[PDB]
Every structure is written in C-alpha cells, then in structure tokens.
Amino acid sequence: AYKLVLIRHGESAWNLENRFSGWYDADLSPAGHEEAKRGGQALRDAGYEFDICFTSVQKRAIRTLWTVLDAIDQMWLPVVRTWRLNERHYGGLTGLNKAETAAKHGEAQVKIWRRSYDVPPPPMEPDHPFYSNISKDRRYADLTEDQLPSCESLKDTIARALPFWNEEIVPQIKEGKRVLIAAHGNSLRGIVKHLEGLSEEAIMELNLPTGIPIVYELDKNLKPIKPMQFLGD
Amino acid sequence: AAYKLVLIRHGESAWNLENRFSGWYDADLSPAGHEEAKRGGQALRDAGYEFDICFTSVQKRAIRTLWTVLDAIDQMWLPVVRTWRLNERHYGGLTGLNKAETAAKHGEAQVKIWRRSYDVPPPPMEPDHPFYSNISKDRRYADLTEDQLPSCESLKDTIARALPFWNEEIVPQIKEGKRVLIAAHGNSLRGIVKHLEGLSEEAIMELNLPTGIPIVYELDKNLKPIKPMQFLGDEET
Ligand SMILES: [Cl-]
C-alpha cells in the first residue's frame, strides 16, 4: 500500500495585504514559515521517511519543503522543481486586492469567477505592472509560447499539472519511492481530483488545509483505498 | 570567457566547535558557518551572479550553504543535484576524535605522515566504531555498491571518486553553456581545482580554499582556466 504525502504551503506576504499573488513569487510570511515548521515536526514525530520530493518553482512552496526536510532530517533527499506545480495563474488580477478587483471588473464577473471551474481571469496584459516580473522571468524560458499562461482557470491549472503527475511522479510511486509533494492549493487540487475521481463542483468545493501533511494510501493501481487523512494533533 | 564556474566551500560545522573530525558525519553548520554562507550569497547578489543548475553533496553543511546562497540571490527555483561524490573526505576511524585523542591513539609519527601525504588513508571505520552505524548504515548510501562505500579515504581517494561526477554530470552542463554553482567541501572542491588547474599533489595539499567565499573561474572552450581563481567580496575578506 503506497504512502503519498502532500503539503500545501501556508500564509504568504501578499496574503497579509490581501493581494492575489498567483504566479507572483511571494515569500512566506513569518507565520506561514511557522506553519511549515509545525508540519515538519508532525512528520518528524510520526517517523515519516521519503525518497524524493516534488515542488513548484515558487519560493513559498520551496521554502515550505526546505523547512519540512530540515525538520525530518532528510535534507539530503533529491528535490525536483517544476512550474507545473505552480499556483493558478491569476492573469490581470495579480497584485490587486478584492476591492480593486470588484471595482475594475464588477460583482457579476467576480461571482462568476468564484463559482466557475473553466472561466479564466483576465489575461495579464503587457502593460500589467507585473507582466515583466512574471512572464519575462528566466525560470520560464524553456516554456513554449503556448505553455506560458497569461491567465488560468482551475481547469487550465489542473490540465498542466496532471501531465507532470503522470510523467514524473507516477513512475516514482510505481518503483516504491516514497514521494513528498510540497505545492499550492490549486495544483494539489488537480492531484486530488485525479486520485479520487472527483467532479468539477466537488473539487471546487474542496479546500485543502495549509501546513498540514495530507496522507494518501494508494493501492497497486494508485487508486486511493480511503479518503485523505491529516497529520498532527 | 567561454564559461563561468562558481564554487563555494561551506563554513564552520558543529563539530569544528568540539575540534572533532567530521568527514562523512553529517554535522550541521555552526551559526558562524551559516552567517558565512549568508555573506557569500550577498556577495553573489551584489555582483549580480546568475546560475542555471546547482550541484552539492548529500551533507547538510553543504546543502544548507547552498540553500542560503540561493535564498540570498533570489534563485531558490534552480534545479539542485545532490551526490555523495561531492561529500567531504571520509576520515575513517578518526571520525569523532579530536586532535589530542588522535595523537594519543595513533602517535606523532603517524599523524605527521597523515598531514603531509596525498595517498595514505586513515584507519578504516570498523563496525565497533561509534559512528559506524550512523554513517555506513545511513539509508542515503544504500544504493552504493560495496566497493563504492568507503571505510576511509586518502585525499587521492576523495579526488578519485569526485572526478567521475565532475566529468560525467558537471562538464556536460558547462559545455551546454549552463552556468554552474558547486557548493561542496574543501577536499571534494580540491579535486575539482586540481583537475581544472592541473595542480600537483604537492600544490593541492598546500591549497586551502577560503570558506564562505564565492570562487569564480573563467574557462575557455576547453574548460581550461584563463586566469587564476577569483574571490568575490569586500577586500576585508
Ligand atoms: Cl533543494
């Protein structure tokens, strides 16, 4: 019965300003850092061991992983980073707060986005304040023109995250390697929806806790044998 | 030049504080060693250095130095490759002893040989040794063949198992134009330097690389260094 472990990073610096970060590379707030320390301790106390870790190219996820590996004394483990585990690309809303967003786009469009699985946000246009910061970052230089989003619905995020699951994480699990994935709410949502065969409405209702190891027990077909469980007190 | 290569040797370890031989023991950085890695990463920030792939050992003093550097230069997203072949020199049965216990147990004639000799090993680390199961039975070495796991290493041994990684995994990256950072240990970095500069056994045993200092190489199309190694930072350091 394979064991798989997910962890979602905690509060960021832009949460403290209630700003949409998306692909903006906000660091953890001091408290999000503390959350990751606690998640680490909870894996230490339970005696968890891994053989390989996956994360995004965003530092709130990476620092969460680093904190956990420090806590469980497995700093030596192989680490693989991919943009395909990044947060959902919130396009033109990147950097705005909720008030600014409602003023610019309307309460109507806002409710549509909050409820919808396949309606993207506005694209990040070249005049956007963070257009260069994100879409001209080196770390994305290898992506083709069609892979680099200017915005993403949840469906888009999941559609680009699941190829990485199948391509690099599934082979490790098949070999018996114990996997730890440190990433973001929306990419992990993709993983959860695929593992559990959830519906659109279901996954959009699922909200993953932060800083808490999420444990999956998988059968030989990598199908969950029971619902996800959490680690801690 | 054709290529830029940066090396960095980690600072003080927790066992440097007890004057104990570390080798493959996975001692963490002391607070001063952590501070040194911060200063080196800052010197890389201020010079605006960029990397595309990082190599390091499987020892947390090297790894943590690398993490601190990547943090300082806002490049935590870079691919990181860890390998035992960049590990510190394995000090065999001397692991855990201080200088005085080593002299008492082994004698002045023997330590004198051990300090001036490129290719005489320390005593092997036997199963009765207090750190044998901590090191040799660490699951992180469980994929090494029997002949690869050392019980002890001369400097020549360390260099001998470091150079194949340099040749097969690092050199292809350099030749692809990728800008490499290597965060490792004095004796493994010594291997890389001796191969890069064609230094003699004598010259490499007299070369002590500064800790916490970015070491910059400019290499030609044949990965030959075009000038002496350079250190980045305030003149003070
Ligand atoms: Cl890493």
CSV table of C-alpha atoms and ligand atoms in Angstrom, one decimal:
chain,number,residue,atom,x,y,z
A,1,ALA,CA,0.0,0.0,0.0
A,2,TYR,CA,1.9,3.0,-1.2
A,3,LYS,CA,2.0,6.1,1.0
A,4,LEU,CA,1.9,9.5,-0.7
A,5,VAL,CA,2.2,12.8,1.2
A,6,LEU,CA,1.1,16.3,0.1
A,7,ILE,CA,1.6,19.5,1.9
A,8,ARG,CA,0.2,23.0,1.0
A,9,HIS,CA,2.3,26.0,1.9
A,10,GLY,CA,0.9,28.5,4.4
A,11,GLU,CA,0.3,32.2,4.6
A,12,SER,CA,2.4,34.4,2.2
A,13,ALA,CA,3.5,38.1,2.3
A,14,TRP,CA,0.7,39.0,-0.2
A,15,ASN,CA,-2.0,37.3,1.9
A,16,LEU,CA,-1.0,39.8,4.6
A,17,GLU,CA,-2.0,42.5,2.1
A,18,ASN,CA,-4.9,40.5,0.7
A,19,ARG,CA,-3.5,40.6,-2.8
A,20,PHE,CA,-3.8,38.0,-5.5
A,21,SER,CA,-0.4,36.5,-6.0
A,22,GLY,CA,-0.9,33.6,-8.4
A,23,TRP,CA,2.5,33.3,-10.2
A,24,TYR,CA,3.9,36.2,-8.4
A,25,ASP,CA,6.7,34.7,-6.3
A,26,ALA,CA,5.6,36.0,-2.8
A,27,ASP,CA,7.7,34.6,0.0
A,28,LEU,CA,6.1,33.1,3.1
A,29,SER,CA,5.1,35.4,5.9
A,30,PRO,CA,6.7,34.7,9.3
A,31,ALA,CA,3.6,32.8,10.3
A,32,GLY,CA,3.5,30.7,7.1
A,33,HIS,CA,7.1,29.8,7.9
A,34,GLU,CA,5.9,28.7,11.4
A,35,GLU,CA,3.1,26.6,9.8
A,36,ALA,CA,5.7,24.7,7.7
A,37,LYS,CA,7.8,24.1,10.8
A,38,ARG,CA,4.8,22.6,12.6
A,39,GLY,CA,4.0,20.4,9.6
A,40,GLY,CA,7.6,19.3,9.6
A,41,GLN,CA,7.5,18.4,13.3
A,42,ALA,CA,4.3,16.4,12.7
A,43,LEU,CA,6.1,14.3,10.1
A,44,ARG,CA,9.2,14.0,12.4
A,45,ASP,CA,7.1,12.7,15.3
A,46,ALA,CA,5.3,10.3,13.1
A,47,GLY,CA,8.6,9.0,11.8
A,48,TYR,CA,7.9,9.6,8.1
A,49,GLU,CA,10.6,8.9,5.6
A,50,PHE,CA,10.7,9.9,1.9
A,51,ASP,CA,12.9,9.1,-1.1
A,52,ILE,CA,12.0,12.0,-3.4
A,53,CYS,CA,10.3,15.4,-3.1
A,54,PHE,CA,8.5,17.5,-5.7
A,55,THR,CA,7.6,21.2,-5.6
A,56,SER,CA,6.9,24.2,-7.8
A,57,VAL,CA,9.3,27.0,-8.9
A,58,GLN,CA,7.8,29.4,-6.3
A,59,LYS,CA,9.6,30.1,-3.1
A,60,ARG,CA,6.7,29.9,-0.7
A,61,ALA,CA,6.3,26.2,-1.8
A,62,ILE,CA,10.1,25.6,-1.9
A,63,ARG,CA,10.7,27.1,1.5
A,64,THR,CA,7.9,25.0,2.9
A,65,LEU,CA,9.6,21.9,1.5
A,66,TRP,CA,13.0,23.1,2.8
A,67,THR,CA,11.6,23.7,6.3
A,68,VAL,CA,10.0,20.2,6.3
A,69,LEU,CA,13.2,18.4,5.2
A,70,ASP,CA,15.1,20.3,7.9
A,71,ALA,CA,12.6,19.2,10.5
A,72,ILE,CA,12.6,15.5,9.4
A,73,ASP,CA,16.4,15.4,8.9
A,74,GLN,CA,16.1,14.5,5.2
A,75,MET,CA,17.8,17.5,3.7
A,76,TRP,CA,19.8,15.0,1.5
A,77,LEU,CA,16.8,13.8,-0.4
A,78,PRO,CA,16.5,14.5,-4.2
A,79,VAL,CA,14.3,17.5,-5.0
A,80,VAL,CA,12.6,18.2,-8.3
A,81,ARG,CA,11.1,21.6,-9.2
A,82,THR,CA,8.5,22.2,-11.9
A,83,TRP,CA,6.4,25.2,-12.9
A,84,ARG,CA,3.7,22.6,-13.5
A,85,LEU,CA,3.1,22.6,-9.7
A,86,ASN,CA,2.8,26.4,-9.5
A,87,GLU,CA,-0.2,28.2,-8.1
A,88,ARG,CA,-3.0,29.0,-10.5
A,89,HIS,CA,-2.0,32.0,-12.8
A,90,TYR,CA,-4.5,34.6,-11.7
A,91,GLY,CA,-3.7,36.9,-15.1
A,92,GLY,CA,-4.7,40.6,-14.7
A,93,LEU,CA,-5.9,40.2,-11.1
A,94,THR,CA,-2.3,39.5,-10.0
A,95,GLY,CA,-1.4,42.2,-7.4
A,96,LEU,CA,-4.9,43.6,-6.9
A,97,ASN,CA,-6.9,43.3,-3.7
A,98,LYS,CA,-10.6,42.2,-3.7
A,99,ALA,CA,-11.9,45.8,-3.6
A,100,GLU,CA,-9.8,46.8,-6.6
A,101,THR,CA,-10.9,43.7,-8.4
A,102,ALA,CA,-14.6,44.4,-7.8
A,103,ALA,CA,-14.2,48.0,-8.8
A,104,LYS,CA,-12.4,47.1,-12.0
A,105,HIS,CA,-14.5,44.1,-13.2
A,106,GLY,CA,-17.9,44.0,-11.5
A,107,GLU,CA,-19.5,42.0,-8.8
A,108,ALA,CA,-21.1,39.9,-11.6
A,109,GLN,CA,-17.8,38.8,-13.1
A,110,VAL,CA,-16.4,38.3,-9.6
A,111,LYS,CA,-19.2,35.8,-8.6
A,112,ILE,CA,-18.7,34.1,-12.0
A,113,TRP,CA,-15.0,33.5,-11.3
A,114,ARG,CA,-15.6,32.4,-7.7
A,115,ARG,CA,-18.0,29.8,-8.8
A,116,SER,CA,-16.5,28.6,-12.1
A,117,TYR,CA,-14.2,25.8,-13.0
A,118,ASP,CA,-13.3,26.8,-16.5
A,119,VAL,CA,-13.8,30.6,-16.7
A,120,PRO,CA,-10.3,32.2,-16.6
A,121,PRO,CA,-9.4,35.6,-15.1
A,122,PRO,CA,-8.5,38.4,-17.5
A,123,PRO,CA,-5.2,37.9,-19.2
A,124,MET,CA,-2.1,39.5,-17.9
A,125,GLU,CA,-1.5,42.2,-20.5
A,126,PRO,CA,1.9,43.6,-21.4
A,127,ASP,CA,1.0,46.9,-19.7
A,128,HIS,CA,0.3,45.0,-16.4
A,129,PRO,CA,2.5,46.1,-13.5
A,130,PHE,CA,3.8,42.5,-13.0
A,131,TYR,CA,3.9,41.4,-16.7
A,132,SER,CA,7.7,41.6,-16.9
A,133,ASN,CA,8.2,40.3,-13.4
A,134,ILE,CA,6.4,37.0,-14.2
A,135,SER,CA,6.1,36.4,-17.9
A,136,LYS,CA,9.7,37.5,-18.6
A,137,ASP,CA,11.2,35.6,-15.7
A,138,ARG,CA,14.2,33.3,-16.8
A,139,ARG,CA,12.7,30.3,-15.0
A,140,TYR,CA,10.0,30.1,-17.7
A,141,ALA,CA,12.4,30.5,-20.7
A,142,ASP,CA,12.1,26.8,-21.7
A,143,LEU,CA,8.3,27.0,-22.0
A,144,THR,CA,6.9,27.3,-25.5
A,145,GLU,CA,4.6,30.2,-26.5
A,146,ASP,CA,1.5,28.0,-25.9
A,147,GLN,CA,2.6,26.7,-22.5
A,148,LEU,CA,3.3,30.1,-20.7
A,149,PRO,CA,-0.1,31.2,-19.4
A,150,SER,CA,-1.3,34.8,-19.4
A,151,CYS,CA,-4.1,33.5,-17.1
A,152,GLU,CA,-5.5,30.2,-15.9
A,153,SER,CA,-8.9,28.8,-14.9
A,154,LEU,CA,-8.8,26.0,-12.4
A,155,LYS,CA,-9.3,23.7,-15.3
A,156,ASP,CA,-6.2,25.1,-17.0
A,157,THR,CA,-4.1,24.7,-13.9
A,158,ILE,CA,-5.2,21.1,-13.5
A,159,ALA,CA,-4.6,20.4,-17.2
A,160,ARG,CA,-1.0,21.5,-16.9
A,161,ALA,CA,-0.3,19.9,-13.5
A,162,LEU,CA,-1.5,16.4,-14.3
A,163,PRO,CA,1.0,15.8,-17.2
A,164,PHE,CA,3.7,16.3,-14.5
A,165,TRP,CA,2.0,13.9,-12.2
A,166,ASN,CA,1.8,11.2,-14.8
A,167,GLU,CA,5.2,11.9,-16.3
A,168,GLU,CA,7.5,12.2,-13.3
A,169,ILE,CA,5.6,11.4,-10.1
A,170,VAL,CA,3.7,8.2,-11.1
A,171,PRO,CA,6.9,6.4,-12.2
A,172,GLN,CA,8.5,7.1,-8.8
A,173,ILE,CA,5.5,5.7,-6.9
A,174,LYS,CA,5.5,2.6,-9.2
A,175,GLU,CA,9.1,2.0,-8.2
A,176,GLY,CA,8.2,2.1,-4.5
A,177,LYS,CA,9.8,5.6,-3.9
A,178,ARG,CA,8.1,7.4,-1.1
A,179,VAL,CA,7.0,10.8,-2.5
A,180,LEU,CA,6.5,14.1,-0.8
A,181,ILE,CA,4.9,16.9,-2.8
A,182,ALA,CA,5.1,20.4,-1.4
A,183,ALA,CA,3.0,22.8,-3.5
A,184,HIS,CA,-0.1,25.0,-3.8
A,185,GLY,CA,-3.8,24.7,-3.2
A,186,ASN,CA,-4.8,24.6,-6.8
A,187,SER,CA,-2.2,22.3,-8.3
A,188,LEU,CA,-2.7,19.9,-5.4
A,189,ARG,CA,-6.4,20.2,-6.1
A,190,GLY,CA,-5.6,18.8,-9.5
A,191,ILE,CA,-3.8,15.9,-8.0
A,192,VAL,CA,-6.6,15.2,-5.5
A,193,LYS,CA,-9.3,15.4,-8.2
A,194,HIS,CA,-7.5,12.9,-10.4
A,195,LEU,CA,-6.7,10.5,-7.5
A,196,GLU,CA,-10.3,10.4,-6.2
A,197,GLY,CA,-12.3,10.8,-9.5
A,198,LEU,CA,-14.0,14.0,-8.1
A,199,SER,CA,-16.4,16.1,-10.1
A,200,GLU,CA,-15.8,19.7,-11.0
A,201,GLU,CA,-18.2,21.0,-8.4
A,202,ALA,CA,-16.7,18.7,-5.8
A,203,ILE,CA,-13.1,19.8,-6.4
A,204,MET,CA,-14.2,23.4,-6.4
A,205,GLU,CA,-15.8,22.8,-3.0
A,206,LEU,CA,-12.7,21.2,-1.6
A,207,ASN,CA,-10.3,23.5,0.3
A,208,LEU,CA,-7.1,21.9,1.5
A,209,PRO,CA,-5.7,22.9,4.9
A,210,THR,CA,-2.3,24.6,4.9
A,211,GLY,CA,0.8,23.5,6.8
A,212,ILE,CA,-0.6,20.0,7.4
A,213,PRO,CA,0.7,16.8,5.9
A,214,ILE,CA,-2.1,15.2,3.8
A,215,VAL,CA,-1.6,11.4,3.6
A,216,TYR,CA,-2.9,9.2,0.8
A,217,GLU,CA,-2.8,5.4,0.9
A,218,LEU,CA,-2.8,4.0,-2.6
A,219,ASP,CA,-3.3,0.5,-4.0
A,220,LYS,CA,-1.3,-1.2,-6.8
A,221,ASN,CA,-3.4,0.8,-9.3
A,222,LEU,CA,-2.5,4.0,-7.5
A,223,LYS,CA,-6.2,4.4,-6.6
A,224,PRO,CA,-6.8,5.7,-3.0
A,225,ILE,CA,-8.1,3.0,-0.8
A,226,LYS,CA,-9.7,5.5,1.6
A,227,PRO,CA,-10.1,9.3,1.9
A,228,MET,CA,-7.1,11.5,2.6
A,229,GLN,CA,-6.0,11.9,6.2
A,230,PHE,CA,-4.1,14.6,8.1
A,231,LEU,CA,-1.0,14.5,10.3
A,232,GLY,CA,-0.8,16.4,13.6
A,233,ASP,CA,-2.8,16.6,16.8
B,1,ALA,CA,35.3,33.9,-21.4
B,2,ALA,CA,33.6,30.8,-22.8
B,3,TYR,CA,32.2,29.8,-19.4
B,4,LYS,CA,31.9,31.0,-15.8
B,5,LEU,CA,32.1,28.4,-12.9
B,6,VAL,CA,31.4,29.3,-9.3
B,7,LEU,CA,32.4,27.1,-6.3
B,8,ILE,CA,31.8,27.7,-2.6
B,9,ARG,CA,33.1,25.9,0.4
B,10,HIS,CA,30.8,25.7,3.5
B,11,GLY,CA,31.9,27.4,6.7
B,12,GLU,CA,32.3,26.1,10.3
B,13,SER,CA,30.5,23.0,11.3
B,14,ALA,CA,29.1,22.0,14.7
B,15,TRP,CA,32.0,19.5,15.2
B,16,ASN,CA,34.6,22.1,14.4
B,17,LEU,CA,33.3,23.6,17.7
B,18,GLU,CA,34.4,20.4,19.5
B,19,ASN,CA,37.5,20.1,17.3
B,20,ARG,CA,36.3,16.7,16.1
B,21,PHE,CA,37.0,15.2,12.7
B,22,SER,CA,33.7,15.2,10.7
B,23,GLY,CA,34.4,13.5,7.4
B,24,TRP,CA,31.1,11.9,6.4
B,25,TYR,CA,29.5,12.6,9.7
B,26,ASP,CA,26.6,14.9,8.9
B,27,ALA,CA,27.4,17.8,11.2
B,28,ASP,CA,25.3,20.9,10.6
B,29,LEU,CA,26.7,24.4,10.1
B,30,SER,CA,27.6,26.3,13.2
B,31,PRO,CA,25.9,29.8,13.5
B,32,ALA,CA,29.1,31.4,12.2
B,33,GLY,CA,29.1,29.0,9.2
B,34,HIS,CA,25.5,29.9,8.4
B,35,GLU,CA,26.5,33.6,8.7
B,36,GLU,CA,29.4,33.0,6.3
B,37,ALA,CA,27.1,31.4,3.7
B,38,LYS,CA,24.8,34.5,4.1
B,39,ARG,CA,27.7,36.8,3.4
B,40,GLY,CA,28.8,34.8,0.3
B,41,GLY,CA,25.3,34.8,-1.1
B,42,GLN,CA,25.2,38.5,-0.5
B,43,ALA,CA,28.4,38.9,-2.5
B,44,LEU,CA,26.8,37.0,-5.3
B,45,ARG,CA,23.7,39.2,-5.1
B,46,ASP,CA,25.8,42.4,-5.2
B,47,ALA,CA,27.8,41.2,-8.2
B,48,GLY,CA,24.6,40.1,-9.9
B,49,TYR,CA,25.6,36.4,-10.4
B,50,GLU,CA,23.2,34.0,-12.2
B,51,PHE,CA,23.1,30.2,-12.3
B,52,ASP,CA,21.2,27.5,-14.2
B,53,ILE,CA,22.0,24.4,-12.1
B,54,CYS,CA,23.5,23.7,-8.7
B,55,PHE,CA,25.5,20.7,-7.6
B,56,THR,CA,26.2,19.8,-3.9
B,57,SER,CA,26.9,16.8,-1.7
B,58,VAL,CA,24.5,14.8,0.4
B,59,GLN,CA,25.8,16.5,3.6
B,60,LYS,CA,23.7,19.2,5.2
B,61,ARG,CA,26.5,21.6,5.8
B,62,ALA,CA,27.0,21.9,2.1
B,63,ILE,CA,23.3,21.7,1.3
B,64,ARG,CA,22.4,24.4,3.8
B,65,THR,CA,25.2,26.6,2.5
B,66,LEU,CA,23.6,26.2,-1.0
B,67,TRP,CA,20.1,26.9,0.3
B,68,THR,CA,21.3,30.1,2.0
B,69,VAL,CA,23.1,31.3,-1.2
B,70,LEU,CA,20.1,30.5,-3.4
B,71,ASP,CA,17.9,32.4,-0.9
B,72,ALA,CA,20.2,35.5,-1.0
B,73,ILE,CA,20.3,35.7,-4.8
B,74,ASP,CA,16.6,35.0,-5.2
B,75,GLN,CA,17.2,31.8,-7.2
B,76,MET,CA,15.6,29.2,-4.9
B,77,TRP,CA,13.9,27.9,-8.1
B,78,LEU,CA,17.1,26.5,-9.6
B,79,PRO,CA,17.4,22.7,-10.2
B,80,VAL,CA,19.6,21.2,-7.4
B,81,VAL,CA,21.5,17.9,-7.8
B,82,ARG,CA,23.0,16.2,-4.7
B,83,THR,CA,25.6,13.5,-4.9
B,84,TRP,CA,27.8,11.6,-2.4
B,85,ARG,CA,30.7,12.1,-4.8
B,86,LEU,CA,30.9,15.8,-3.7
B,87,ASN,CA,31.0,14.6,0.0
B,88,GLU,CA,33.8,15.6,2.3
B,89,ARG,CA,36.8,13.3,2.6
B,90,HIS,CA,35.8,10.2,4.7
B,91,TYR,CA,38.4,10.5,7.9
B,92,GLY,CA,37.7,6.6,8.7
B,93,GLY,CA,38.3,5.7,12.3
B,94,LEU,CA,39.4,9.2,13.1
B,95,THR,CA,35.8,10.3,12.7
B,96,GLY,CA,34.6,11.7,16.0
B,97,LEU,CA,38.0,12.0,17.7
B,98,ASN,CA,39.7,15.3,18.4
B,99,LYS,CA,43.3,16.1,17.6
B,100,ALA,CA,44.6,15.1,21.0
B,101,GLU,CA,42.9,11.7,21.1
B,102,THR,CA,44.1,11.1,17.5
B,103,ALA,CA,47.7,11.7,18.6
B,104,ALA,CA,47.4,9.6,21.8
B,105,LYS,CA,45.8,6.7,19.9
B,106,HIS,CA,48.0,6.8,16.8
B,107,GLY,CA,51.2,8.6,17.6
B,108,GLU,CA,53.1,11.6,16.4
B,109,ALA,CA,54.9,9.7,13.6
B,110,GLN,CA,51.6,8.6,12.2
B,111,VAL,CA,49.8,12.0,12.2
B,112,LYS,CA,52.9,13.6,10.7
B,113,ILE,CA,52.6,11.1,7.9
B,114,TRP,CA,48.9,11.8,7.6
B,115,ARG,CA,49.3,15.5,7.2
B,116,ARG,CA,52.0,15.6,4.6
B,117,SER,CA,50.7,12.6,2.4
B,118,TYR,CA,48.5,12.7,-0.7
B,119,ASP,CA,47.7,9.0,-0.6
B,120,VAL,CA,47.9,7.4,2.8
B,121,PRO,CA,44.5,6.6,4.2
B,122,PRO,CA,43.4,7.0,7.9
B,123,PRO,CA,42.4,3.8,9.6
B,124,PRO,CA,39.2,2.2,8.3
B,125,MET,CA,36.0,2.8,10.2
B,126,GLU,CA,35.1,-0.6,11.6
B,127,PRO,CA,31.6,-1.7,12.9
B,128,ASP,CA,32.8,-1.2,16.6
B,129,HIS,CA,33.5,2.5,15.8
B,130,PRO,CA,30.9,4.8,17.5
B,131,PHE,CA,29.8,6.4,14.2
B,132,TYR,CA,29.9,3.3,12.0
B,133,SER,CA,26.1,2.7,12.0
B,134,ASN,CA,25.4,6.4,11.9
B,135,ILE,CA,27.4,6.8,8.7
B,136,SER,CA,27.9,3.5,7.0
B,137,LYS,CA,24.4,2.3,7.7
B,138,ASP,CA,22.7,5.6,6.7
B,139,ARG,CA,20.0,4.7,4.2
B,140,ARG,CA,21.3,7.5,1.9
B,141,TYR,CA,24.3,5.3,1.0
B,142,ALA,CA,22.2,2.2,0.4
B,143,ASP,CA,22.5,2.4,-3.4
B,144,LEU,CA,26.3,2.4,-3.4
B,145,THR,CA,28.0,-0.8,-4.4
B,146,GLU,CA,30.2,-2.4,-1.8
B,147,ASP,CA,33.4,-1.0,-3.4
B,148,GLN,CA,32.0,2.5,-3.6
B,149,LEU,CA,31.1,2.9,0.1
B,150,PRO,CA,34.4,3.9,1.8
B,151,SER,CA,35.5,3.0,5.2
B,152,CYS,CA,38.3,5.6,4.9
B,153,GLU,CA,39.9,7.9,2.3
B,154,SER,CA,43.2,9.4,1.5
B,155,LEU,CA,42.9,12.7,-0.4
B,156,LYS,CA,43.7,10.8,-3.5
B,157,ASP,CA,40.6,8.6,-2.8
B,158,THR,CA,38.3,11.6,-2.4
B,159,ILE,CA,39.5,13.1,-5.6
B,160,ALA,CA,39.3,9.8,-7.4
B,161,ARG,CA,35.6,9.4,-6.6
B,162,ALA,CA,34.8,13.1,-7.1
B,163,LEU,CA,36.3,13.5,-10.6
B,164,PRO,CA,33.9,11.0,-12.3
B,165,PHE,CA,31.0,13.0,-11.2
B,166,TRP,CA,32.6,16.2,-12.4
B,167,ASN,CA,33.4,14.6,-15.8
B,168,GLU,CA,30.0,12.9,-16.4
B,169,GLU,CA,27.5,15.2,-14.8
B,170,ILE,CA,29.0,18.7,-14.4
B,171,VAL,CA,31.2,19.1,-17.5
B,172,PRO,CA,28.3,18.3,-19.9
B,173,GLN,CA,26.3,21.1,-18.3
B,174,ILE,CA,29.2,23.6,-18.6
B,175,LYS,CA,29.7,22.7,-22.2
B,176,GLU,CA,26.0,23.3,-22.8
B,177,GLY,CA,26.5,26.9,-21.7
B,178,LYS,CA,24.7,26.3,-18.4
B,179,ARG,CA,26.1,28.4,-15.5
B,180,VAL,CA,27.1,26.1,-12.7
B,181,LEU,CA,27.3,26.7,-8.9
B,182,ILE,CA,29.0,24.0,-6.8
B,183,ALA,CA,28.5,24.1,-3.1
B,184,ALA,CA,30.6,21.4,-1.6
B,185,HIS,CA,33.6,20.6,0.7
B,186,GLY,CA,37.2,21.5,0.9
B,187,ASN,CA,38.6,18.1,-0.2
B,188,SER,CA,36.0,17.5,-2.9
B,189,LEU,CA,36.4,21.0,-4.3
B,190,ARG,CA,40.2,20.4,-4.1
B,191,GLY,CA,39.6,17.6,-6.5
B,192,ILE,CA,37.8,19.9,-8.9
B,193,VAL,CA,40.5,22.6,-8.6
B,194,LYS,CA,43.4,20.1,-9.1
B,195,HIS,CA,41.8,18.8,-12.3
B,196,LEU,CA,41.0,22.3,-13.6
B,197,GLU,CA,44.4,23.8,-13.0
B,198,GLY,CA,46.5,20.6,-13.4
B,199,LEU,CA,48.0,21.1,-10.0
B,200,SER,CA,50.4,18.7,-8.5
B,201,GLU,CA,49.7,16.5,-5.4
B,202,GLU,CA,52.1,18.8,-3.5
B,203,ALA,CA,50.4,22.0,-4.7
B,204,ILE,CA,46.9,20.8,-3.9
B,205,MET,CA,47.8,19.7,-0.4
B,206,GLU,CA,49.0,23.2,0.3
B,207,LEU,CA,45.9,24.9,-1.1
B,208,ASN,CA,43.2,25.7,1.4
B,209,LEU,CA,40.2,27.3,-0.1
B,210,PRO,CA,38.5,30.1,1.9
B,211,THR,CA,35.2,29.2,3.4
B,212,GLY,CA,32.0,31.1,2.5
B,213,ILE,CA,33.7,32.9,-0.4
B,214,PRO,CA,32.4,32.6,-3.9
B,215,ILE,CA,35.3,31.2,-6.0
B,216,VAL,CA,35.0,32.3,-9.6
B,217,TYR,CA,36.6,30.6,-12.6
B,218,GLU,CA,36.6,31.8,-16.2
B,219,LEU,CA,37.2,28.8,-18.5
B,220,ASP,CA,37.9,28.7,-22.2
B,221,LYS,CA,36.3,26.4,-24.8
B,222,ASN,CA,38.4,23.5,-23.4
B,223,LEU,CA,37.3,24.3,-19.8
B,224,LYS,CA,40.9,25.4,-19.2
B,225,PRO,CA,41.1,28.4,-16.7
B,226,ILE,CA,42.1,31.6,-18.4
B,227,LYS,CA,43.2,33.4,-15.2
B,228,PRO,CA,43.7,32.5,-11.5
B,229,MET,CA,40.7,31.8,-9.4
B,230,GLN,CA,39.0,34.9,-8.0
B,231,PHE,CA,37.3,35.5,-4.7
B,232,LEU,CA,34.1,37.7,-4.5
B,233,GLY,CA,33.5,40.1,-1.7
B,234,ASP,CA,34.8,43.1,0.3
B,235,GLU,CA,38.6,43.4,0.2
B,236,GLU,CA,38.3,42.9,4.0
B,237,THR,CA,37.5,39.3,3.4
C,1,CL,CL,16.8,21.8,-2.8
